[PDB]
Design a protein around this ligand. Structure first.
Ligand SMILES: [Cl-]
Ligand SMILES: [Cl-]
Ligand SMILES: [Cl-]
Lengths: 93, 100, 92
């Protein structure tokens, strides 16, 4: 069993911000990401996306700080982080 | 870095329940929510014409106290009549003070 | 309040793997699951995210099997989170 502790960062925002956000997390160290369509107050196309990425503790805070600084003031964004244990997670570090 | 500890409550149920579940969490104190598609065990996919057979997942960021109020309400009012999944997880949230 | 601690195992993989993965988690002890569409870089010809609430022992059994049988041959992501579940006794 190769299981290691990492962080799962989740971001919810308009789907139109996808390219920018995907670029931001890769730029900050993320080695992958998963997207799920999503919606909120007020159909799965043209709404929001839930972007998730598995990263190390340090990269997680880099991403969150970048979102708080550059995206939160100008867009409706939700961002949070959870603790996870990942199979062969060494690769995401 | 404005990060605070909160709870993420997740509810999975039939799609027709969306309106009532949203009203219910807002009534109990949640300030926002996110809906995503869910299926499995026979349920219909995201592109199906059959909307009734589709499920939805509702996620909401709330305080510890509001989380259990929501979970209790689900256990009392919804679980007895619908196939529902509901759980809670610990999260640290950017600018989370607005969800309390 | 009927709330108990369990584990939430998440697996992201090619959608054609759905059938095999569902059978694998059921075989190893999972008493239910949910599937949600998922897409990654380069976006059916798509992925799925399988989630299952299980006991801590069943979670490790599932993850072990994924590492052995699937990770070497397919592009898969698998992880576990701690969760407290309403009427969770039914998943153990
Ligand atoms: Cl954490
Ligand atoms: Cl918790
Ligand atoms: Cl855990």
């Amino acid at each position: 069993m190769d299981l290691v502790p990492l962080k799962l960062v989740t971001i919810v925002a308009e789907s139109l911000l996808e390219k920018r956000l995907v670029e931001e997390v890769k730029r900050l160290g993320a080695k992958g990401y998963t997207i799920t369509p999503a919606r909120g107050e007020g159909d799965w196309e043209g709404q929001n996306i839930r972007l998730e990425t598995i990263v190390s503790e340090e990269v997680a805070l880099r991403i969150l700080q970048r979102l708080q600084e550059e995206y939160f003031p100008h867009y409706a964004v939700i961002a949070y982080v959870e603790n996870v244990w990942v199979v062969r997670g060494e690769k995401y570090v």
